[PDB]
Ligand binder design. Structure first.
Ligand SMILES: CC(=O)N[C@@H](CCN(CC(=O)O)CC1CCCC1)C(=O)N[C@H](C)C(=O)NO
Ligand SMILES: [Zn+2]
Ligand SMILES: [Zn+2]
Lengths: 255, 255
């Protein structure tokens, strides 16, 4: 198989006699196929930065091993150079401390795996406008990816209502240094939707949210150049192409 | 405060001048807050069956009492009314003796309270699969709750490796009537994890186990309808929603 970096892929495996699915030592979780009682699914994602050329995954059964080979692909992401870089411009300590705490908090959440579906059907798009900045916009240096765009931005004037893309549990609902007013929902199975740069948060941590419920209002808060809604999906442990993911997910799960 | 039956809640209290926290007559133990040195914690659990509508706790300090009110919610559990062709006759006499003796042994263990932490940070789920039968699915013969599912079952084919959810000391590691092959671990502070219906046990009573370590193999043993791993948590003296509890626990104790 093949896969563009920063994308997720839904793997299908036989349910019967299945023990585990592994990428080296790291285990990869499995969930039931919705339309086929004899199958299970697993999500595999390639990081945007520094992917391997190739992945070999092993599905272990009672009676056999099934190898799965996945070649990384570069894709057609847009990319610009940078002309200066090295141990430069950090913030004040209590601000580094803020940056550090929030990273830790976020990583704890994205590491967590809720082993049931908190979603309800297909993902919807969080609002009905148009993309102004695509997933995977890179910035490069030493021919390496210095940074990339880890979600997709939708055009939004300040104050535009923003609806949960699917059902779930709110894990984050506060102001953060980079993302600004942030909401993050757990949908189950390590799948997380992200809504950043809001002007107003209308949910709180722990709250169960349904698909199409209002989570807040768009803004320009946090590290961003203007008002816009930033939409992200983390799955299989990584940030991946949100519209690509949604499209893959809904292929399997649409009710 | 509000709490759903069959859930645990972490109460935070001022450390200094604290003498005692009580629910009527019974004392509720307390342990240190892991981050904030000025605070202590307690765990309060409502039973699933026959909770009171309301609970009032007093925290006694040197110079004041402090009331904590907790109102029981019914929550949203699944529930199938029970046909009664006759809720009448029992199983044999040395078998009833088996049942009674094992119940007596388990209560001894669950009544204990080890006053220090045996865990090591956050809990993991004991394996990377999906839920096939949730906690709190009840069977309601007429108007009372006859029985309910006291843990959560994960899809597992017979032979699936099962890992300790946190570090601890093994208290039970043997075949019991209803649970089948059973491992139960003391994590400290009266928190116990449960692993039932196993096909093979790989630990001994009294053994020190580390989080992520192999405890045994999944199975179909005991009172269960097919292969599966059943995962439970006891805390505050009652069986509580184990994914909810894990999530609450990790929020405080994650390293
Ligand atoms: C990668 C990512 O998801 N970036 C986000 C927030 C940052 N944070 C992620 C999280 O905490 O979930 C991680 C930080 C990395 C180093 C320290 C913490 C963001 O605001 N992206 C750009 C600017 C944007 O949104 N353009 O529109
Ligand atoms: Zn963006
Ligand atoms: Zn069970």
């Amino acid at each position: 198989m093949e896969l563009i970096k920063g994308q997720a892929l839904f793997l299908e495996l036989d349910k019967k006699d299945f023990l585990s699915l592994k990428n080296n030592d790291k285990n990869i979780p499995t969930f039931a196929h919705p339309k086929n009682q004899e199958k299970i699914l697993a999500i595999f994602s390639l990081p945007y930065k520094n992917p391997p050329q190739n992945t070999k995954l092993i599905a272990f059964y009672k009676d056999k091993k099934e190898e799965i080979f996945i070649k990384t692909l570069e894709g057609n992401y847009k990319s610009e150079k940078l002309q200066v870089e090295n141990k430069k411009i950090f913030p004040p300590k209590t601000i580094q401390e803020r940056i550090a705490k929030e990273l830790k908090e976020a990583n704890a959440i994205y590491s967590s795996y809720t082993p049931k579906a908190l979603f309800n059907g297909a993902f919807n798009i969080p609002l009905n406008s148009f993309i102004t900045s695509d997933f995977g916009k890179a910035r490069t240096f030493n021919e390496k990816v210095a940074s990339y765009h880890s979600g997709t931005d939708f055009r939004a004037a300040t104050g535009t209502p923003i609806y949960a893309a699917n059902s779930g549990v709110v894990k984050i609902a506060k102001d953060r240094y980079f993302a600004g007013n942030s909401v993050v929902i757990d949908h189950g199975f390590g799948i997380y939707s992200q809504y950043y740069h809001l002007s107003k948060i209308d949910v709180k941590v722990g709250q169960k949210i349904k698909k199409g419920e209002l989570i807040g209002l768009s803004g320009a808060s946090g590290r961003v150049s203007g008002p816009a809604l930033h939409f992200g999906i983390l799955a299989g442990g990584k940030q991946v192409d949100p519209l690509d993911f949604v499209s893959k997910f809904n292929a399997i799960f649409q009710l």
